[PDB]
Design a protein around this nucleic acid. Sequence first.
DNA 1: AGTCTGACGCGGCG
DNA 2: CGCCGCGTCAGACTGCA
RNA 3: GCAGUCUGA
Lengths: 51, 100, 79, 50, 50, 231, 222, 50
Amino acid sequence: REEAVVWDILDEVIREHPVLLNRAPTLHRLGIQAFEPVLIEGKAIQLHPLV
Amino acid sequence: KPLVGTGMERAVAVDSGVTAVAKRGGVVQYVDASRIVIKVNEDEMYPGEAGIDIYNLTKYTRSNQNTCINQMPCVSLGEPVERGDVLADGPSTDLGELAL
Amino acid sequence: ARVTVQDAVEKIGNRFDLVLVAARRARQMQVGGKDPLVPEENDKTTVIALREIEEGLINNQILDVRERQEQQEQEAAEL
Amino acid sequence: EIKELLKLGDLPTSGQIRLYDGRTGEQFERPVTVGYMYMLKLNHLVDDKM
Amino acid sequence: QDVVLGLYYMTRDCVNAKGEGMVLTGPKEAERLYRSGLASLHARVKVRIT
Amino acid sequence: VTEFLKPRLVDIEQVSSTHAKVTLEPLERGFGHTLGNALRRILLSSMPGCAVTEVEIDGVLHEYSTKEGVQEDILEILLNLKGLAVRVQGKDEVILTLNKSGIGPVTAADITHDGDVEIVKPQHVICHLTDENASISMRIKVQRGRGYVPASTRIHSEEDERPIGRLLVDACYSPVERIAYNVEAARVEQRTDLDKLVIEMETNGTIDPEEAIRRAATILAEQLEAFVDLR
Amino acid sequence: SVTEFLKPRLVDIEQVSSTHAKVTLEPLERGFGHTLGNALRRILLSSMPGCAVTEVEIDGVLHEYSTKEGVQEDILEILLNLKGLAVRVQGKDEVILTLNKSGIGPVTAADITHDGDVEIVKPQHVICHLTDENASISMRIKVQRGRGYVPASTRIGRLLVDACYSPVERIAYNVEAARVEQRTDLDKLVIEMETNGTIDPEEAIRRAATILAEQLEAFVDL
Amino acid sequence: TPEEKLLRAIFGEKASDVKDSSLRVPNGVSGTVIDVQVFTRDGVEKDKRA
DNA sequence: AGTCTGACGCGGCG
DNA sequence: CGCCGCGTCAGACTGCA
RNA sequence: GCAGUCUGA
């Protein structure tokens, strides 16, 4: 149902919790990197320009 | 429409079947979002004929790619049309030209 | 808050050792009844563990000494 | 011919106008190519990708 | 490709840019002079740097 | 030196029904562009206006449909009603009614007249009826708001039920369509450093140019209170 | 309602120094971060009143490049040290301070001849260095009240100084995304301010907002 | 199962004989039903909407 | 097993 | 001359026992 | 589950 308390829960569940981001082909080691999630409202994963 | 095009838009739109092109010149007798009734000219109707072309437009059907194909009447009431004139724009056609 | 573990890596001079020491301490904090030695700043037990590592408060030797001491003192509680 | 058509519509024939920042309200230091490009929306919707 | 162009544009110099030759107390005065519009981003200038 | 000249709303020039030029004068050197861009952003983003948010046509169940005798789809009728420029006095919501028959264009002049609802462009074509027996009859709920609220977000208001046949229109409430401004050197009795700001507004006709400047400056001056006190 | 706007609820001030602060305001309406930030930035930079050194006449120096013996800087750097001299004058718009100092070592701002209404905010501000133990420097410094920044290239054997009238020396801001009950489009305005000492940072922010809100008073609806 | 055997005997109803296999809108897609076509095998009773 | 077959690569390697 | 290999991830649509 | 087709990076 996505009640409004679920989002306050979720903002804690992903507070210091890294996620791995991977773009295939993983030609080398840096093809998988772990970032901390900032919850955004779109449907597109936002990816720092330097990586 | 494209403000900048190449002139091959009117052929790409007409030669596919998305548009409803007039088979015989005449005068638009009736026009509705789903129908165009053209009254054929006097020198174009065969002897022994009502002399009226009815183009039933396709409204909101599912494409193969789940997009929408939808024919809107381009002509308005009382307007005269020639043979081969676009009567109803298809999907991605603006007033007869292909507009993607 | 933790953005780089470079400080905690000189204290435990290996990166593959930092992970194991920090995970042992973070599990002590998460399912053990143990409390952090640094002020819990709305962090996760992993980040609290690393913040304890980088301040010299925790390493594998300190964890082993403390576990030994608690094991002996709980073995002492037998009447 | 492109520049002649621009000059017919009173636009600058160089193709670039000076623009201002919407946020800070001040002028971009160099003239910026502004014009009408025919943009398409491909069937690679992010609703279908997420 | 956008950061290198930004920093390339920032760091370059032009010979008669607005506010050339003046003497600045430091980087903060340079930023104040730029945002005020009193000097160009390329004004060849003398700034006391620490 | 510590004293600043304060701008007064010197002149308003209504070039057209939808276009106007308001002059703020005199401004000290530098406040021209400050006020210009502050007012430009506040006007262009936060003006209150009325917009059509619900249509109810009698024989129609959904947008992806056609009415017999109406040349447009129902979806094009809705896209035409989205641009209905209307102003309402003393209400935050009103349900206009449209009834038309016979061959000809159905325009905003054919909406049932209410005294406190002024349709500022009666020539706005809503649809065309192409049959002498065709007839269109709709209810048009215009609403006061701010900014742009799409219908897919207003399905959030899950009150008791929405009927089948109540077509939701995206709501773009803001009346201002373009804001330019120019800081020109205009003088007082004897001073040369004073400037004059000319704000060039283009609206849909449902806001008064002076009222828009007053509303924008009020938004700004009540947003600056958090900075004036700074507790 | 259509006229009710989000006003800043969280205003966090972090004084990094006596003259440097970060003021975080949250939340603003979408796009109001840049409106308030840029209006305040422009006012703090170029329209804020204050008093600073405009001219200086040194006894033996005729133009900006003629060096002076005994002082370890060229005149081009004594002027650069005078430009940063934070000074307050209460009852006048123009004062002529006098700096007389002979001997050895630094000549700080504390060695300026005292006038009762002129305060020096940083008396440890070094102006020059005397090196010969018979080196004497005697200069007249014209403090003048104004507003904004007025470079010397515009005001054109006295020597001109860029007159940094404004107490602000660095105003920056950035607008990041705040959130209230699952609206993420709201704004959060972080202002980063540094003044020269004549005015604490939050007082400068308040005086700038007072200037803007006093300009607007002819249009507001009370 | 035994615990669920106690549970539905506590709150007083066991499950019915039929399983919910109805058609449902996929997650994320939200639209308007613009057409319904019902095809019944020849020899099958047509329901009311057919 | 009869095809009213398919084939119509390439480069090492053993 | 026969045998072994010939990038990764992903979305869609048919037809098939 | 598979084969074919198309497409994306």
